[PDB]
Ligand binder design. Structure first.
Ligand SMILES: Cc1cc2c(cc1C)N1O[C@@]13C(=O)NC(=O)N=C3N2C[C@@H](O)[C@@H](O)[C@@H](O)COP(=O)(O)O
Ligand SMILES: Cc1cc2c(cc1C)N1O[C@@]13C(=O)NC(=O)N=C3N2C[C@@H](O)[C@@H](O)[C@@H](O)COP(=O)(O)O
Ligand SMILES: Cc1cc2c(cc1C)N1O[C@@]13C(=O)NC(=O)N=C3N2C[C@@H](O)[C@@H](O)[C@@H](O)COP(=O)(O)O
Ligand SMILES: Cc1cc2c(cc1C)N1O[C@@]13C(=O)NC(=O)N=C3N2C[C@@H](O)[C@@H](O)[C@@H](O)COP(=O)(O)O
Ligand SMILES: *O/C(=O\*)C(=O)[C]([O])C([O])=O
Ligand SMILES: *O/C(=O\*)C(=O)[C]([O])C([O])=O
Ligand SMILES: *O/C(=O\*)C(=O)[C]([O])C([O])=O
Ligand SMILES: *O/C(=O\*)C(=O)[C]([O])C([O])=O
Lengths: 330, 330, 330, 330
């Protein structure tokens, strides 16, 4: 947010780590399109409704969250700050926001989960199905509340910034959960049968995939082109959200991510029908600023912007915000 | 207008007062969108009609106005010139244009109204309903002809220019009517029952709110996103105007504001169905130029541009201009 | 064309005469929109048709023309070259292109018509109906073949370039036909009854005005916003052309002008249904280059570009070009 | 690709040869539009499908190709490298990609075909029908597998770069097949009756021409505006592809070219329904880099980008990629 935040991160981080963070695949057409898609959306606000008890809280996966928002899974957070995932998870817990532990976290998932709060666990499918399901079991044993199964990474997209930078994981950053293979619908079934936790498919863009996700027993989906980091030229999730929300017809939670940069963007996502958004890169920008406090400031400012936007739009509740109409600009 | 006017104001005013005037909320997406929306509108002019008696006059709220236009409520006009509201109101009266006295005027509403002309009074709802209705009574006792109830400010939008400027009301600028709380439909009813003056709801953007405004007994609405100063990402009024005009079906006056910068823009608004426009920032630019004469020059030039545009479009009357067709460009 | 032409005119002409030529009214929104509208049009070419006898000729108002094009009426052509209208008319005659003599020509209409060729006469309605009809009679007596009645100038649009330039007709440039008032449909009838020449209404933009023009006995219309020089914000003629062509259903010739800068633009206009185009400013650019030869070079190059474009589009005739389909871009 | 490639060619080639290569006709509106049209296309990827045997191979004209792609006919390839067509054809053969020998090749078609691989032959119709059909016979005798009949060049478009450059074929570059006239549908029939090879009409943009091509016995069409080099203002092939694919209803192969710059662009073309693309200018950029190796590197990188894009989109086969949905952006 407040560009300075991104800029502040521009300066403190090595250019090639900032590139790892900011970049997309190919020509970054889908990265830029996420922003263009949000900027095209205008909200039609409602006036003169009772705002005496404006609340940004939602119930999701059986638990309350302070905002319609969770921290997106972003790998190797020690790349951005020495406290890495622990800093972010602490601030998320204190802000009442779920935090998604990555399969490729630079601190073990048991440690991040001990922080408390509302930890979710993002799963990459491993070449060994038994390693995959043991990771799922670890996450559940550790008290994670949802498995965020990433389904748009059969393999990683081609990041031209990382290729031009000759960038590689510095020696001091490890994959702490370890001491990969394309997921299919069969993999989704294996996870679903292995856990009672809600399974959330992250990276759904096609309407029929959203429908199939509900048929497959998913508790939610994240409508997402992976921040423009996977298929270059993939439609933005925000452009598919309304259609997907209609097709799912309440059958699972529908989250969206990609380019959420303000409370007004959260409002736009919710007016398009999203249950909640994920926020990725901005949380990592703040992480270069004071973990339990730099991230906490981001979340407080986002929390205030959401509350402001909702009230100006006449929405006492997130549910009311989902019933707002929108109009697409140019 | 004539940019020089804005520029002329650029130089004479402190940078932080010009920012108070020119800015919007958030990223100023709705501020810029008001202009983009007008620029997209093209008029289909009619030819060869009798123009022998081209008149820009309208009847609104029982009285004639010289142009389909009123001065928008803009608070603390002494911020822009030492004569402040008195300068503007005098020029408006002389131009035959209604002038909207602000709740937050830097000269008392009784004084501005003594200037004569066609004063309207803009109301902010106060935390105390009895203070609100006493303000309404004052305005009516003072001869104001309409209550412009601002309904899109449950609280003020977040103005990043003002936050970055650390801007605050200079010591010499006071709220002369005094020596706030979210309005609801119940507040609208309280005002309507308290006065025989037409009540005009300013800040309506949703079609169903426009319909409800007529149901609630409003004499008019102003289709408006508050000059991009309230919800950032709120649709421009100009983009909702045609739909709202159709839904109201003549049930109240439908004004529009936001980015009106010329007589051609007035024509566009009227061709989209508006009864009249409000003009805000341009009147304040002129106010740095000679009150009873700088504002008067703006209004004369606007008056001439409206007359020119109407005749070139084949419209002998504002009513004829409302029957013009339009085509949206890119 | 070949920008150099415009640039070449940029240098030779006084800045304030080039401004008189190049400018539009208001913010020049309609001036720029004429170009944006043509650039949005894409032609769907046809392949493999017989091109053995590609011809750019058309019949219009009973006579053959070499190209689907005439020189637009542009006043005071001695502003641009000492031979003024005589230079242009000679080159037009030699190119087989009709030439529109202006009411405000800087050489008498009898003299221009003596040049020969296919002279049309553009009429401004004069405050005195008898002066108007005597001008029509002069034109007819002089052998003009069509009266181009300009119907979009009840008065002249506000040209901000001319106002900022304080520009005025130099002393050596006269209105040679003399030694004005809004036209109405009654004026059109007066002209139609006064002459057997086809009457062509120039400046029609509304579909119902095009229909009424046919009802009124017009032999043609020019779909035109006057080169963006009259109502600022008037739709481009090119954007109304297809609709107008359909509504007229062959009932009169439908010309278009505004921003025609190449043979490809001529093809686009004809594919949208135009009978012919008018070309204005480019002819005057060339006029700063050698009358009977600078204009003649423009017309030869335009003639070649039209022939090229038509053949590449698979059109042996202008009629075939009118049956081409188009697709609008962004 | 990797701009450097184009830039690398920017430096090594004479400015006027690079212009011959890069330029289009007229204002290059159709050249630029080919790129804008691809950039507007977004793919809706599918998730969680079996990718165990992702293959980019297709069958076309009875033979397998490694990728849904062939080298476009580009004349006088010795303009770009001393080995010219032989370098490109060798790399194409090694990459399993068809190579289109030009009528105006700077090495004889018998020699290029001796290289082996999958040579196609592009035909310009000659003023002498017997010369045309003897060229067709030569190509067939030499083992070419398809006649690519160019149908959008009754004559060459007007290339303003070449006219401004006064550019002409250097003395050392010859038309090796020799030691022209507009084609019609009758010419197409003459070719079809003269050969058992599939006849592929290159330069089809109109739906009815695509239909007629199938009626005429074509084995394929290339939906193409000739890289923006023929009619300036011709619609991009990519913008007509979906409509043409639907109208042909499997009746012939439908190729597309124009602005294909990546594997993602190949995916977009195939998702719009194309059987295969042609790639022109990029192959010639690489040709300034090492024939049997510079072109080979381009084709390997394109091959990898296609495979990547297909898998990220959930497509195990090119056929699956054709069933992807797309969404048009702005
Ligand atoms: C920037 C970044 C993103 C990801 C990662 C790393 C980096 C450095 N790693 O790959 C994750 C992972 O490990 N698992 C996964 O599912 N998604 C990942 N993502 C992307 C994901 O969470 C997005 O949905 C998010 O970026 C939304 O957009 P934003 O708010 O605009 O940033
Ligand atoms: C610029 C400015 C505007 C307002 C204010 C102050 C400033 C410095 N204060 O907040 C008022 C108020 O006190 N009450 C209210 O109803 N509206 C207000 N407005 C806005 C309002 O009148 C708009 O509708 C107008 O700006 C149209 O757009 P414009 O012509 O483009 O300028
Ligand atoms: C530039 C210019 C134009 C005119 C004039 C003067 C100047 C200096 N005088 O006013 C005429 C007149 O005397 N009568 C009339 O009917 N139209 C006139 N026009 C405009 C008219 O002919 C247009 O339709 C044309 O400009 C098309 O556009 P273009 O090809 O882009 O230039
Ligand atoms: C650049 C260039 C192109 C052609 C030529 C020369 C040059 C220097 N000569 O004229 C050919 C020919 O001899 N025969 C023919 O059918 N097409 C030709 N083309 C064009 C053709 O193959 C296009 O379809 C292609 O450019 C796709 O676009 P791209 O990938 O963006 O480049
Ligand atoms: O491709 C991406 O942006 C990613 O998701 C990360 O690199 C990752 O997950 O490893
Ligand atoms: O937010 C705004 O632009 C305003 O309306 C003024 O600041 C106000 O009314 O006080
Ligand atoms: O307004 C215009 O551009 C004109 O038509 C000329 O100035 C004119 O006709 O006098
Ligand atoms: O016009 C073009 O780009 C071409 O096709 C080549 O110049 C050619 O074929 O000779």
């Amino acid at each position: 947010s407040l560009a300075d935040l991104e800029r502040a991160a521009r300066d403190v981080l090595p250019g090639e780590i900032f590139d790892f963070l900011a970049g997309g695949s190919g020509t970054e057409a889908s990265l830029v399109a996420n922003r263009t898609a949000l900027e095209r959306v205008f909200v039609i606000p409602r006036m003169l409704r009772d705002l005496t008890d404006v609340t940004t809280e939602i119930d999701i996966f059986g638990r309350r969250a302070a905002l319609p928002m969770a921290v997106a899974p972003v790998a190797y957070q020690r790349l951005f700050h020495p406290e890495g995932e622990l800093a972010v998870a602490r601030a998320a817990r204190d802000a009442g926001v779920p935090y998604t532990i990555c399969t490729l976290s630079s601190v073990s998932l048991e440690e991040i989960a001990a922080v408390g709060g509302r930890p979710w666990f993002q799963l990459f499918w491993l070449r060994d199905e038994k390693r995959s399901l043991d990771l799922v079991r670890r996450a559940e044993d550790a008290g994670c509340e949802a498995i965020v199964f990433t389904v748009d990474v059969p393999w990683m997209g081609r990041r031209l910034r990382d290729m031009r930078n000759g960038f590689a994981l510095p020696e001091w950053v490890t994959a702490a959960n370890f001491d990969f293979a394309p997921a299919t619908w069969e993999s989704v079934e294996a996870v679903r049968a292995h856990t009672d936790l809600p399974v959330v498919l992250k990276g759904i863009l096609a309407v029929e995939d959203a429908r199939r996700a509900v048929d497959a027993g998913a508790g939610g989906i994240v409508v997402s082109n992976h921040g423009g980091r996977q298929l270059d030229g993939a439609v933005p999730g925000i452009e598919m959200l309304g259609e997907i929300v209609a097709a799912v017809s309440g059958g699972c939670e529908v989250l969206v991510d990609g380019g959420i940069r303000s409370g007004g963007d959260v409002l736009k996502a919710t007016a398009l029908g999203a249950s909640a958004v994920l926020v990725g890169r901005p949380v990592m920008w703040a992480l270069a600023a004071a973990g339990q406090d730099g991230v906490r400031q981001l979340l407080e400012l986002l929390a205030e912007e959401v509350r402001d936007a909702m009230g100006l739009a006449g929405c006492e509740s997130v549910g009311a915000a989902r019933r707002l109409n929108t109009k697409l600009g140019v």
